[PDB]
Coordinates of C-alpha atoms and ligand atoms in Angstrom, one line a residue:
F146 CA -14.6 -7.6 0.7
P147 CA -17.3 -7.2 -2.0
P148 CA -16.5 -7.6 -5.7
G149 CA -16.6 -3.8 -6.3
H150 CA -13.7 -3.3 -4.0
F151 CA -11.5 -5.1 -6.5
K152 CA -13.3 -4.0 -9.8
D153 CA -13.1 -0.2 -9.2
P154 CA -9.7 1.5 -9.2
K155 CA -8.9 3.0 -5.8
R156 CA -6.8 5.7 -4.2
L157 CA -5.3 4.4 -0.9
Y158 CA -5.6 7.3 1.6
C159 CA -3.2 6.8 4.5
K160 CA -4.5 7.8 7.9
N161 CA -1.0 8.9 8.8
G162 CA -1.0 12.5 7.4
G163 CA -3.6 12.0 4.7
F164 CA -1.2 10.9 1.9
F165 CA -2.3 8.8 -1.0
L166 CA 0.0 5.9 -1.9
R167 CA 1.8 6.8 -5.1
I168 CA 3.5 4.3 -7.4
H169 CA 5.9 5.6 -10.1
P170 CA 6.8 4.2 -13.6
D171 CA 10.5 4.0 -12.5
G172 CA 9.6 1.8 -9.6
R173 CA 9.7 4.4 -6.8
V174 CA 7.0 4.5 -4.2
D175 CA 6.0 7.5 -1.9
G176 CA 2.9 9.5 -0.9
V177 CA 1.2 12.7 -1.9
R178 CA -1.7 14.7 -0.6
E179 CA -3.0 15.9 -4.0
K180 CA -6.0 13.8 -5.1
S181 CA -5.6 14.4 -8.9
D182 CA -2.0 13.1 -9.0
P183 CA -1.8 10.8 -12.0
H184 CA 0.1 8.0 -10.1
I185 CA -2.2 7.4 -7.2
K186 CA -4.9 5.5 -9.1
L187 CA -4.3 1.9 -8.1
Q188 CA -5.9 -1.4 -8.9
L189 CA -6.4 -4.0 -6.2
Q190 CA -6.4 -7.6 -7.5
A191 CA -7.7 -10.5 -5.6
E192 CA -4.8 -13.0 -5.9
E193 CA -6.3 -15.4 -3.3
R194 CA -8.9 -15.2 -0.5
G195 CA -7.6 -12.4 1.7
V196 CA -4.5 -11.8 -0.5
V197 CA -4.1 -8.9 -3.0
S198 CA -1.6 -7.3 -5.3
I199 CA -1.6 -3.5 -5.7
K200 CA -0.9 -2.1 -9.1
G201 CA -0.1 1.5 -10.0
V202 CA -2.3 1.9 -13.1
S203 CA -0.3 4.7 -14.8
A204 CA 3.1 3.2 -13.7
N205 CA 2.1 -0.3 -14.9
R206 CA 4.0 -1.7 -11.9
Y207 CA 3.0 -3.7 -8.8
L208 CA 3.8 -2.7 -5.2
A209 CA 6.6 -4.9 -3.8
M210 CA 8.2 -5.1 -0.3
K211 CA 11.9 -6.0 -0.4
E212 CA 13.9 -8.1 2.0
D213 CA 15.3 -5.0 3.7
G214 CA 11.9 -3.4 4.2
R215 CA 12.0 -1.0 1.3
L216 CA 8.9 -0.4 -0.9
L217 CA 9.4 -0.4 -4.7
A218 CA 7.2 -1.4 -7.6
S219 CA 7.9 -4.3 -10.1
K220 CA 6.8 -5.0 -13.7
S221 CA 5.6 -8.5 -12.6
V222 CA 3.6 -9.9 -9.7
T223 CA 6.5 -11.5 -7.9
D224 CA 6.3 -13.2 -4.5
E225 CA 7.2 -9.8 -3.0
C226 CA 4.0 -8.3 -4.4
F227 CA 1.5 -10.4 -2.4
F228 CA -0.2 -8.8 0.7
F229 CA -2.7 -9.9 3.2
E230 CA -5.5 -7.4 3.1
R231 CA -7.3 -6.9 6.4
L232 CA -10.1 -4.6 7.7
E233 CA -9.1 -2.7 10.9
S234 CA -11.1 -0.9 13.6
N235 CA -12.2 2.2 11.7
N236 CA -12.7 0.6 8.4
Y237 CA -9.3 1.4 7.1
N238 CA -7.3 -1.5 5.6
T239 CA -3.9 -2.9 6.3
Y240 CA -1.5 -4.7 3.9
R241 CA 0.9 -7.2 5.4
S242 CA 3.6 -8.8 3.3
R243 CA 3.0 -12.5 2.5
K244 CA 6.8 -12.9 2.2
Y245 CA 8.0 -10.8 5.2
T246 CA 5.1 -11.6 7.5
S247 CA 5.8 -9.1 10.3
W248 CA 6.0 -6.1 7.9
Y249 CA 3.3 -3.8 6.5
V250 CA 2.9 -1.3 3.7
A251 CA 3.1 2.1 5.4
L252 CA 3.6 5.8 4.9
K253 CA 5.3 8.2 7.3
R254 CA 3.9 11.6 8.2
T255 CA 6.7 13.0 6.0
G256 CA 5.1 11.5 3.0
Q257 CA 7.8 8.9 2.4
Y258 CA 7.3 5.2 2.9
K259 CA 8.1 3.7 6.3
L260 CA 10.6 0.9 6.2
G261 CA 8.8 -2.4 6.6
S262 CA 10.9 -3.4 9.7
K263 CA 9.8 -0.2 11.5
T264 CA 6.1 -1.0 11.1
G265 CA 3.7 -2.7 13.5
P266 CA 0.0 -3.7 13.8
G267 CA -1.0 -0.7 16.0
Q268 CA 0.6 2.1 13.9
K269 CA -1.3 4.8 12.1
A270 CA 1.2 4.5 9.3
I271 CA -0.2 1.1 8.1
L272 CA -3.9 2.2 7.8
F273 CA -5.3 3.0 4.3
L274 CA -8.8 3.8 3.3
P275 CA -9.6 2.8 -0.3
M276 CA -11.4 5.6 -2.0
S277 CA -13.0 5.9 -5.4
Ligands
LIG486 C1 -0.8 8.7 16.7 O1 0.0 8.7 15.5 C2 1.3 8.1 15.6 O2 2.2 8.7 16.5 C3 2.5 10.1 16.1 C4 3.4 10.6 17.2 O3 3.8 9.8 18.0 O4 3.6 11.8 17.2 C5 3.2 10.1 14.8 O5 4.5 9.5 14.9 C6 5.5 10.1 14.1 O6 6.2 11.1 14.9 C7 6.7 10.6 16.1 C8 7.2 11.7 17.0 O7 8.2 12.5 16.2 C9 7.8 9.6 15.8 O8 8.3 9.0 17.0 C10 7.3 8.5 14.9 O9 8.4 7.7 14.4 S1 8.6 6.2 14.8 O10 7.3 5.6 14.6 O11 9.6 5.7 13.8 O12 9.1 6.2 16.2 C11 6.6 9.1 13.7 N1 6.0 8.0 12.9 S2 5.8 8.1 11.4 O13 5.0 9.2 11.0 O14 5.2 6.8 10.9 O15 7.2 8.3 10.8 C12 2.4 9.3 13.7 O16 1.3 10.1 13.2 C13 1.9 8.0 14.2 O17 3.0 7.1 14.2 S3 2.8 5.6 13.9 O18 4.1 4.9 14.1 O19 2.4 5.5 12.5 O20 1.8 5.0 14.7

């Protein structure tokens, strides 16, 4: 990924229903289709080669996957906030937990997050297009 991918804030558009990933100041995570929603502007940070954290800019919190597969957002970049970022077949990205290595960040067609343990590499739910 080129430097601009990290420098410019992104909205993460999920292929599964067209929901943008939304991170809230209370720690909640969900999805919304409205592009002007104030809590869908995210910052991708290169933590290591191929590894990112995902910060909700307004929320001032980082996306975390918990040990039971839930998505929340933390004030600090804990070990639950590191994700392998990978490019898939139609140029959407996936985000796989560095801690729970079989589980992906994902949104259901209902607009709520999909439990990590119910995700998989071939699901539409795990595909996100970073948009400006
Ligand atoms: C092609 O897109 C995937 O498959 C869709 C589908 O099978 O209709 C759709 O899946 C959602 O609806 C189906 C049918 O009701 C559910 O079986 C599925 O739940 S499940 O994955 O837990 O079994 C449900 N997936 S969800 O939206 O992620 O909750 C969906 O557009 C795509 O599903 S996928 O799992 O993201 O690939």
